[model samples]
Target: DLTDAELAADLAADAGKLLLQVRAEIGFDQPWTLGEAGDRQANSLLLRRLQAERPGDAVLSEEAHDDLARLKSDRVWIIDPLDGTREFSTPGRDDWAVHIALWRRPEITDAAVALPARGNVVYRTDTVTSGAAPAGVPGTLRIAVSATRPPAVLHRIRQTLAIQPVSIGSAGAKAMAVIDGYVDAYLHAGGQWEWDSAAPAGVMLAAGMHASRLDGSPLRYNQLDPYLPDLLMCRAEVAPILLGAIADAWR
Candidate 1:
């Protein structure tokens, strides 16, 4: 029997494999078509695996129906079978990921994020690397931002520290990059759901990273509403700096 963490890793890896297969067979032409198919197929695979592996646990998946039943179960699997579907469908980019998070009550205890297109790497709670800010931290804060919607707060950060914005595809990939020490932070505001952040947040929190809202609020999981909106997964040292920047920028 797979432990919860192992199951999360296993399911995410399988989902990633299946997504790569879908990308191969579909072969990048109609991005809309490719993304649609990938979403359906990946979601189906994750749904099936969760049901077979943990029959009792309820599931909340992006591609599946949002049955209110998940609200009752303390152990609910929150998954985004294929994140960054646009990047996945596009040729010559390996930024997409498979997100699998186990939300047990007040927080997510175990989770796994599989970067299939990025040479099949999986980041999970099982094997946490070095803590949030590695010893050799970068001089400039390398923040992972959305390619399209970067935070306006960077303007303020630039005055204090030479900040660099790295646009990584998929929410999972960006958060994992911070955990992996590729970036100092994955900062975003405006909008995102629990499904987008739970697995990544779980692993980051496990790794001792500062995972919270823009205003430094603790992020709750498995609530009736999954729309978490804003999130910041960053190096602990920079949490206050960024939060202050966000506040100063808006005010």
Candidate 2:
């Protein structure tokens, strides 16, 4: 039974080592094999590693050759090897993240958001640091929107709130924004999939961010179609307001 904190905590700590391994194996030191194919290759390595370890589960990876096959499995793992590969290719823009999310078929999961270079390992379960700040935790309650396509809802929030919006290439980086206490929330209404937000979603939810669809329903995982149309995640204190704002955006 997970209220919120437990899920985020377990995801960040329990999965930290394995996630780090996946990142190192694929993200570190690679040839110029660019584009989706290269991303798939990197994801392939993670898929094989995770599936082999959790043999009972199925895996759906953005970098792998197939997406629909994962729907057939009872428990599926969704992973994006390198979110924002183009940013990864460039210097000083190492905001791209390696995502690995485990979904138990119809059930959602806890989450962990880790940034390797920054040495910040934020899981869903961690408590916010006590301090005097806007979010009242100094670094807490900050968020990062996409550098490629910034969502307008994010802009509206910025106009109303005193929050900062960092830029990152991959989808996971946005999730990490909340997890790492860089922002209070992260939201994406544009096209995305199970792989894009699945892993990070688990981590953020566990960390006590209000994780769900923009409409405030619990986020689901694994279906005939792996692509989830919209996503939203936020810190514990700010989720309700953020949720209302997100729903308003669509209407």
- In terms of lDDT, model 2 sits at 0.60
Q: Which portions of model 1 miss their true places by more than 4 Å?
A: 132-139
lDDT of 1 at 235: 76
Model 1 CA RMSD to the hidden true structure, in angstroms = 1.8
Error of 2 at 162 (Å): 5.7
lDDT of 2 at 123: 37
The C-alpha TM-scores of every prediction are: 0.93, 0.72
For lDDT, the strongest prediction is 1
lDDT, candidate 1, equals 0.86
Q: Write the per-residue lDDT of candidate 1 for residues 164-239, one digit (tens) a residue.
A: 7888989999998887778888888778888899999999888888899888889988778888888889877878
- Off-target runs (Cα >4 Å) in candidate 2 are 1-41, 67-69, 110-114, 120-143, 152-164, 248-251
The TM-score, computed over Cα atoms with residue i paired to residue i, of candidate 1 is 0.93
